[PDB]
Amino acid sequence: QSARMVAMKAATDNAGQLIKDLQLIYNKLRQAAITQEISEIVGGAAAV
Amino acid sequence: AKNEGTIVMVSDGIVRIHGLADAMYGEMIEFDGGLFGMALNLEQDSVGAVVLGNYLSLQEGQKARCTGRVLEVPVGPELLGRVVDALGNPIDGKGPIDAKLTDAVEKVAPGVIWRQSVDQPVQTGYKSVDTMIPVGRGQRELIIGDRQTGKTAMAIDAIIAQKNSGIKCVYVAIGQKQSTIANVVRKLEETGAMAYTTVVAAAAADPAAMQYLAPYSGCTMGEYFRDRGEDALIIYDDLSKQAVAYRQISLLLRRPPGREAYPGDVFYLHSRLLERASRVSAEYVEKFTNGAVTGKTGSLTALPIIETQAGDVSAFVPTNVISITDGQIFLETSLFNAGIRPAVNAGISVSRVGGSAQTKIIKKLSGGIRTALAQYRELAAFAQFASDLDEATRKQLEHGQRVTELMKQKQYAPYSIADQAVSVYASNEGYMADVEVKKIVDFDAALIAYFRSEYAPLMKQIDETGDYNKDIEAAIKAGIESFKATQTY
Amino acid sequence: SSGRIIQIIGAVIDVEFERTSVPKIYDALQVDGTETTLEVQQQLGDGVVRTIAMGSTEGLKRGLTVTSTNAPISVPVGTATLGRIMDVLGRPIDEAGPVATEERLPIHRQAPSYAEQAASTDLLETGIKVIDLLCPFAKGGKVGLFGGAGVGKTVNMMELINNIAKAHSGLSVFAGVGERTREGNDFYHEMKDSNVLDKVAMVYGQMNEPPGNRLRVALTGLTMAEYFRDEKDENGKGRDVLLFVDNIYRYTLAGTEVSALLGRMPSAVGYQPTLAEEMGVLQERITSTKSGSITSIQAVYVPADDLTDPSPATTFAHLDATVVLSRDIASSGIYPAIDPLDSTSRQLDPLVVGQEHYEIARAVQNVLQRYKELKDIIAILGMDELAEEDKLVVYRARKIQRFFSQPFHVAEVFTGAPGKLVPLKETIRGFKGLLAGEYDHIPEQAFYMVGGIDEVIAKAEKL
Amino acid sequence: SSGRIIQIIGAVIDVEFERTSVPKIYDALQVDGTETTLEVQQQLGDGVVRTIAMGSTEGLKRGLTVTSTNAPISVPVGTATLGRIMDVLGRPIDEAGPVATEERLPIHRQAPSYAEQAASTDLLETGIKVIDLLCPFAKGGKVGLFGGAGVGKTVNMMELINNIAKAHSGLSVFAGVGERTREGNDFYHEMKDSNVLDKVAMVYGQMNEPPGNRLRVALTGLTMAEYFRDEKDENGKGRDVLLFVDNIYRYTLAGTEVSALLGRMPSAVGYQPTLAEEMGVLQERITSTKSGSITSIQAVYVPADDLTDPSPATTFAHLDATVVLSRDIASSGIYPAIDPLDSTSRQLDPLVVGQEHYEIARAVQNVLQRYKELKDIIAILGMDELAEEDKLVVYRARKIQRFFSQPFHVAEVFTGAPGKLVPLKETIRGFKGLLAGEYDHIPEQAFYMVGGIDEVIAKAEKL
Ligand SMILES: Nc1ncnc2c1ncn2[C@@H]1O[C@H](COP(=O)(O)OP(=O)(O)OP(=O)(O)O)[C@@H](O)[C@H]1O
Ligand SMILES: Nc1ncnc2c1ncn2[C@@H]1O[C@H](COP(=O)(O)OP(=O)(O)O)[C@@H](O)[C@H]1O
Ligand SMILES: [Mg+2]
Ligand SMILES: [Mg+2]
């Protein structure tokens, strides 16, 4: 039993690190998507 | 005059033309110097045209005239085993083609009253596609995947394995550099599969209009046999290149953009092309030929191709194509790199037509492998942890591994109905439970080779008839038992 | 009096008329010398109107003449359009002769007012057990079918219209546009196969046709359903009319395809400015009036496989029931395979359906969800756990899953035209008995391919 | 015949003309006032031509005058250019006197016909472990290197030049487009000291020039190689040719820079509407027809370090062999940074290379894919949980990833270690032994920057 506690606590810490990295990637992708949509809308509205 | 016009603007293959009052839509126009142009926009005071050719020798003030005849291509049975440009001009230099029928390129599909269901198969020579995702005559099936994942190899194998079937094949190449077209044509010639086929080529150096119009001309050439009671099969190397060419030729025409800069009429572009693949009824055949042909039905199957960017199947174009086609075959990079070739994803690939298309023995035998593969998809996550499970899951995982390892086959080696039948029967009846996970391919090859050599009279009966009966079951069992011993792999 | 085309781009055509005579919005014009009809979409001043083409473009050139009918596109309706196939404008395409009727109705009408709504929510009885238990249908509701991964949509609709054909007086309409053509052929031949092709009307729209034809199609199906509902017997009870629409996604896509060229800016992820309005104009006419009731069944495809896209976002705000079926369990052998847990309704309220029905449906849903979370693969040890605590849950889940199976008349294989429209009570009482546990002795395989709780009792007692 | 400048914006100048003498497309014009050569890119009616200026645009006003040469940009060809340095227009820039030849060829011509293509089958061996093992090359083909800034593309191009051109009998053409100048001078002097200058022609257009000069500088090297291919010895056989393009990405980036000023609508991520056609009209002329064989090597730049960008996505299908450079492996200190996955060649099949070669390559790729897939559970959970076979796969993948590293001849300065060369059979033997399992006990720290299986044994003993 004494091993399982440290095993799961290390697993939780690693999960925290991974979620932080994924959050960074998510923010970058979201900003890129918003920029692309706005650019497309403005370009289309210029055409009409 | 009402038929003579001048050129006002020339830019990047698009010509803005004055005059030409009685100019119809899509009607060929004749530039000086033997150049043919289309008409795609008719504004209040100027006409937009695209020049199919080399526009580099057109200037301002060069005259043009209206012909009054829509795009037409030469059709006939002379085009078999030949390589032509989008408009039907031979380019292999083997002499002129004299087919004696000219046909329009833009026509409508048959009505709903004239169509019929799909009851006959179309073999591809691949165990996975032939047992899991069957294709029948008249069906439209889409191959979708990522760069360098075996997408064309499958289509070329499909063309190669219709040697005895008696169905014509048509191949359309869009955007490919001419070296690959030459290589493909040479490979078709080597195996004797070129006698029944025609090739339409619009390479990367060719204008955007050629790559825009190639698939329609291919379909018009393929309809000739369907409307007369013989079958046909058309393959488009990559409608993605065609969509991009349409985007270029439209954006140059000042048409409003949209999602990903693709203008409107993008869904129409692929729908009106993929709707023409259907099976007609014998009454339609009889009426078209005025009684020359009786008691026969025509067909035209399609297998178009579309590529994805790192698995983004949710882009603008793949979703449209996925919504139109009956079935979808997915090729995965993480499967191709793992050695599983052809890399077919079983859990995302479906076919709507289903068992009706397959023969009796195939329809009877595919079920066991289907259910085994389906179950093996579920226990996948618990694969790094074999020790923590009951024996039932162990046996299921083993069987799933064996089945997924039998579905691996080499290129340019089509199997015959009897080969698939024997292999599937050997798998289902638990005759490969004693062999390790490796050497499965060797066992398959050795069994197939032995069965062709010693039980050839049966093999012929299975090939010609495709029936299932107790005698056939007994003979297959006896042969497999004989080979299981007294032989090496 | 007469006008002349001045600009042709795609299917969008600008025509110009004298200063006084300008056709109103949605009026239909005839182009002499061709089969083309023009529908007005916008006015642009100086006597110029944008129009879409009803028919196909047979080489129209600048300067062609056009006269005005001064009335919207009116479809001929009546009792003489029963068992025929007609195009968007009402011409037959089955080569069985012209339609001999005189009653014509415009396809552009306003929705029923506030004071004309029904004064109750009765539920339409159906022979399908699952749709009648865990997702009750509404006699005026507009249900939608998002079930994918299966061609059974046509087969399911065939069973439904056929049981309805017996259950409902008749006069049903099928407005299929932008559909799989061989599926439409299978529809037509199936209806002729069961000798029920009479009393039904069909309107088909081909994908190759210009957006003008691929549009204003459901409108025609809607107009035909209405002439029937308002019909009244000497008694005066109108008819419960049904309507089918194979694809609405194609309707929205045609709108999107023509919007840009009509002078309208892009919005959202690229859709047209007027999405909610264009869908509401259709969805607000499918209502249960005081006299008569129209119900609708529409197959809706979700692009990109998400429920966030604007088109399904505007679609989900109009429905009353959502039915999703998947091959994952259809593979087991249950022919009427519809995902029980996924299905949802705005009529499963305790008061409208009865307290007993509400509680029994909730209990069944809870049992199914419990079995789903406690899979025998979710628990690697498999069986031998929670004896009668979760084991009995597993057995009951198996029994209910098999009892979902229902033999049908259309499937002539292994079945002598059963056509079982099981009484709603019988299903409720059988499920009550199963929940109470009085069937724990019945063999599980006896519960498959069962017509009714009595039927299953006989099947168990024989062996 | 004399025109007046009308508008100057950036590098784009639009110029009027008389009505009957407008110059055609791609012709060249000369400004009388200063040294400038303009190239026609499009016609705009009313006898107005849009043009791109080749050179500086400072000091050019409106109302300047221009004459027309009525012929495209012609460059001198022949053997006179051997061992000389030339501008984009052919002017020498080595301060070694004029070039003595009247043979001029235009730089705008059509691509070879389909009928005269040729099949390339003879193999070519570089000496680099990973290229000669997983992505094999063949004489007369096409090769490409894809990477992002700072990963190793040039140091590999120069190494290939060292291992191939120096030891090959035949001419060579080197064109530099959109790259650093210091590298150009270093290359010129390095070739001079080795007394192999007289076999190489050179063209240089670098990042310091207006986009007009950076846009049409690859075509000049192309024309020179084209003449060197079709030329035949009198009563004698022809010779091989080689072509090196330093960066072809700048060729498209120049068009992207000047696209909007030409009046074209934007598309995708700010790219010009006509991209692939623009890439093809150049990438098709690099061909080995029935007359001669051209072996070209190009380096392709990956913007923002993603391969999904349209520019490196369109170009993937124009090459026979593709080698993809990875920044993660570079940051790991592994050199050269070539990704074993995502690197393919059209000459890896059992017939062309044999059986053992194919089996070795396939097993290597399989092992590396297995490890890459396994990485995630290691990331979350740890190492002890995996099966022992998976631990063995992990160790083998690490050793394989290291063994692909190799010191270079032109990279002694960076690291202070001498260059190395490995025969192909030694690569095959080493990888077969590694996958066999006989080198498991050898520490994985001995597989770094050493060439050949034996040197590894010696290094392992040295530790
Ligand atoms: N069944 C197979 N077994 C082994 N190798 C295969 C198999 N199928 C294809 N390959 C290999 O994969 C490559 C084929 O790639 P493919 O033809 O799909 O290229 P692509 O770029 O995706 O297609 P396109 O023709 O549209 O440009 C070749 O290297 C071929 O040897
Ligand atoms: N094989 C190698 N060994 C050691 N260093 C290298 C190697 N390849 C590249 N480098 C280093 O990486 C840096 C970037 O590589 P280089 O090719 O010069 O630029 P880029 O990657 O932008 O083309 C250089 O400064 C060089 O010293
Ligand atoms: Mg291909
Ligand atoms: Mg760099």
Backbone phi, then psi, for B371, in 5-degree steps? -70, -35
- Structural domains for chain B: 1-72 (2.40.30.20), 73-365 (3.40.50.300), 369-485 (1.20.150.20)
Check whether residue D201 and residue D315 sit in a common domain.
yes
Q: How far is D335 from chain A (nearest CA, A)?
A: 27
D190 & D246 share domain: yes
How many CB atoms are closer than 10 A to CB B292?
10
On chain B, the residues whose CB falls within 8 A of the CB of C270 are 258-259
Catalytic residue among B69, B352, B377, B394: B352
Give the contacts of C277 (CB within 8 A, at least 6 positions apart). none
Place of tokens 């059963």: C418
Q: Are residues C31 and C165 in the same domain?
A: no
Measured distance CA(D364)–CA(D396) in Å, rounded: 10
Q: Which of C16, C104, C139, C153 is catalytic?
A: C153
Is C149 marked as binding a ligand?
Answer: yes
> Do D252 and D303 share a domain, yes or no?
yes
Same-domain status, D192 and D81: yes
How far apart, in whole angstroms, are the C-alpha atoms of residue D25 and residue B11? 9
C309 and C366 fall within a common domain: no
Please list, in sequence order, all residues whose beta carbon lies within 8 angstroms of the beta carbon of residue C284, skipping any fewer than 6 positions away: C111, C112
Same domain, residue pair C206 and C235 = yes
Residue D357's Cβ-side half-sphere holds a number of Cα atoms within 13 Å equal to 18
Is-contact D360 D369, C-beta < 8 A?
Answer: no
Spatial separation of the C-alpha atoms in residues C412 and C420, rounded to whole Å? 13
* D47 touching chain B per CB within 8 A: yes
Query: How many angstroms away from the CA of D357 is the closest CA of chain B?
Result: 15
| Host H or E run for residue B17 | strand B14-17
Instruction: Give the residue carrying structure tokens 């099969």.
Output: B233
The DSSP annotation for D302-347 comes to: -GGG-TTSHHHHHGGGG-SEEEEB-HHHHHTT-SS-B-STT-EETT
**Which atom from ligand 1 is nearest to the alpha carbon of B152?**
17
Residue of chain C whose Cα is closest to the Cα of A41? C266
Angle in degrees, CA D417, D419, D424, rounded to 5: 140
Which is catalytic among the residues C180, C398, C429, C432? C180
Taking the CA of D412 as reference, the closest ligand is: 2
In this complex, the residue of D265, D270, D379 whose CB is nearest that of residue A18 is: D379
Asked whether residue D151 is marked as a ligand-binding residue, the answer is yes
Q: What distance in Å separates the CA atoms of residue C395 and residue C443, rounded to the nearest whole number?
A: 10
Q: How far out from the chain centre does Cα B336 lie?
A: 20
User: Look-up: residue for tokens 């199919």?
Assistant: B52
Nearest 5°: the CA angle C191, C195, C196 is 60
**C264–A48: do the CB atoms touch at under 8 Å?**
yes
How many CB atoms are closer than 10 A to CB C362?
13
Angle between helices B178-190 and B151-160 (to 10 degrees): 30
Cβ atoms D174, D221 nearer than 8 A: yes
Q: Which residues, other chains included, contact C271 with Cβ-Cβ below 8 Å and sequence gap of 6+? A: C252, C256, C259, C310, C311
* Diameter of chain C measured on Cα atoms: 87
B150 Cα–ligand 4 center, Å: 31
B156 CA → ligand 3 middle, Å = 9
On whether both D110 and D27 belong to a single domain, the answer is no
Amino acid at B153: A
Q: What are phi and psi of D109, to 5 degrees?
A: -150, 170
D406 touches ligand 2 (CB under 6 Å): no
Is the pair C, D in contact (3+ CB pairs within 8 Å)? no
| DSSP 8-state assignment for residue D432 | H
Q: How many residues does chain A have?
A: 48
Chain A residue with Cα closest to B259: A40
Residue D66 assigned as binding residue: no
A40 in C contact zone (CB under 8 Å): yes
Q: What number of CA atoms fall less than 13 Å from residue B97's CA on the CB side?
A: 25
Burial (Cβ within 10 Å: 0-12, 13-18, ≥19) of residue C355: exposed
Residues in chain B: 489
Strand order across the B305-308 sheet: B305-308, B141-146, B327-330
Task: Please tell me the distance between residue D229's alpha carbon and the centre of ligand 4 in angstroms.
Answer: 30
In sequence order, what DSSP letters do the residues of C396-438 get, joined into one string? HHHHHHHHT----SS--TTSSS------HHHHHHHHHHHHHTT
Residues 6+ positions from D113 with CB-CB distance below 8 Å: B91
Instruction: Name the domain count of chain D.
Output: 3
Chain position carrying tokens 């059509």: D110
Token pair of C203 as six digits: 């309107």
The two counts, helices (H) then strands (E), for chain C are 14, 16
For the record, the structure tokens of D74 come out as 């012609």
Token pair listed for D217: 């500088």
- The A-side interface with B (CB below 8 A) comprises 40, 43-44, 47-48
What does the alpha-carbon distance between residue D12 and residue B373 come to, in Å, rounded to a whole number? 62
A38 touches chain C (CB under 8 A): no
Q: Which residues pair with B51 in a beta bridge?
A: B37
The token duo for B132 is 């899991």
Coil vs helix vs strand at C238: strand
Distance CA B394, CA B313 (A): 34
Give the B window 357-376 contacts with C, CB below 8 Å: 371, 374
To the question of whether residue C218 is assigned a binding role by annotation, the answer is no
* Among candidate residues C12, C41, C72, the one where a domain is terminated: C72
State whether D287 and D269 are in the same domain.
Answer: yes
The answer to whether the Cα torsion of C371, C372, C376, C381 is positive or negative is negative
Q: Is the CB of D178 under 6 A from ligand 2?
A: no
End position of a domain, from candidates D347, D373, D401: D347
Give residue D13's Cα distance to chain centre.
31
Closest chain A CA to residue B256: A47
**Cβ pair C395, C444 in contact under 8 A:** yes
C48 and C89 assigned to the same domain: no
- Nearest chain C residue to A45 by CA: give it: C265
Give the residues across from B224 on adjacent strands.
Answer: none
Q: Where are the strands (E) in C22-171, listed by range?
A: 27-30, 37-43, 48-54, 65-72, 74-76, 85-86, 104-106, 142-145
Q: Taking the CB of residue B100, how many other CB atoms lie within 10 A of it?
A: 9
Dist CA B61 CA B43 (whole Å): 20
Alpha carbon distance D329, B348 (integer Å) = 33
List all residues of chain B from 283 to 312 with a beta carbon under 8 Å from chain C.
Answer: none
Which atom of ligand 2 lies closest to the CA of D335? 1
Residue in the block written with tokens 């182009």 = C31
Range of the domain at C387: 348-463
Strands (E), D82-129: 85-86, 104-106, 123-124
D380 and D331 in one domain?
Answer: no
**Cα–Cα distance for residue pair B236/B234, rounded to 1 Å:** 7
Query: Is C153 a catalytic site residue?
Result: yes
Give the end of a domain, one of C20, C53, C72. Answer: C72
Closest by CA to B265, choosing from C265, C214, C247, is C214
Same domain for D168 and D297, yes or no, is yes
- C94 CB neighbour count, 10 Å cutoff: 15
Flag whether residue D117 sits within 8 Å of chain B, measured between CB atoms. yes
What's the rounded Cα separation, in Å, for the pair A15 and A19?
Answer: 6
- The finding on whether D153 has its CB within 6 A of some atom of ligand 2 is yes
Of D97, D105, D147, D114, whose CA–CA distance to D326 is shortest? Answer: D147
